[PDB]
Amino acid sequence: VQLQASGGGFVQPGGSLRLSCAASGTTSFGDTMGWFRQAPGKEREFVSAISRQDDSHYYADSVKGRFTISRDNSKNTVYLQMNSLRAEDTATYYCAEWMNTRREFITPYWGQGTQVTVSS
Amino acid sequence: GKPIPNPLLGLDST
């Protein structure tokens, strides 16, 4: 599954980052794309998702108002803009594509992560 | 990958 996340790096608190999630364009796994994050020693945390039925945007309460998810479409890419970052947003960020089940479980198809470190 | 809890349950969309 080729779903590479990029855009990570070192950032100071209050800064912004724009992450990128480049989908196949050849294969679709495929109606929903979400961002997750995983920090050392913590549980995986869902961040945000964009789902086509008309474009629906979802945000975890912990990033609502600070993060924005969007799609370029022409480039088969989903973006996550993260604003007013804080130390607790430090983590590896990665994408999954899946078919929205509206049920208990989903089957995610995972991409590779990009590292985001918010520090002084 | 293996199935995981559906993360969109309980969330509003915009």
Side-chain angles (χ1 to χ4, degrees), chain A residues 19-38:
Chain A
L19 306 188
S20 284
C21 180
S24 181
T26 278
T27 320
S28 176
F29 279 113
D31 108 319
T32 303
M33 186 86 74
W35 282 93
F36 299 77
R37 73 192 175 175
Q38 171 84 81

Side-chain angles (χ1 to χ4, degrees), chain A residues 44-52 54-111 113-115:
Chain A
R44 168 185 77 252
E45 179 174 28
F46 169 75
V47 177
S48 183
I50 186 157
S51 180
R52 262 161 153 150
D54 216 322
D55 261 12
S56 277
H57 310 70
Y58 299 85
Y59 300 93
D61 280 350
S62 57
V63 304
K64 189 177 62 100
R66 294 192 297 132
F67 291 15
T68 306
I69 195 171
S70 52
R71 205 198 290 95
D72 186 289
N73 225 350
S74 331
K75 308 155 179 325
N76 309 114
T77 296
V78 171
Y79 302 93
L80 181 70
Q81 180 151 330
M82 301 180 297
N83 302 303
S84 167
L85 281 298
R86 342 187 195 226
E88 42 282 9
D89 301 309
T90 293
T92 309
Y93 285 72
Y94 44 94
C95 280
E97 192 170 54
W98 71 90
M99 198 74 196
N100 178 13
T101 65
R102 297 177 290 272
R103 286 154 166 78
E104 201 182 327
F105 307 99
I106 57 163
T107 308
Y109 290 87
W110 292 110
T114 184
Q115 166 73 219

Side-chain angles (χ1 to χ4, degrees), chain B residues 4 7 9 11 13-14:
Chain B
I4 64 159
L9 298 177
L11 300 187
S13 56
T14 48

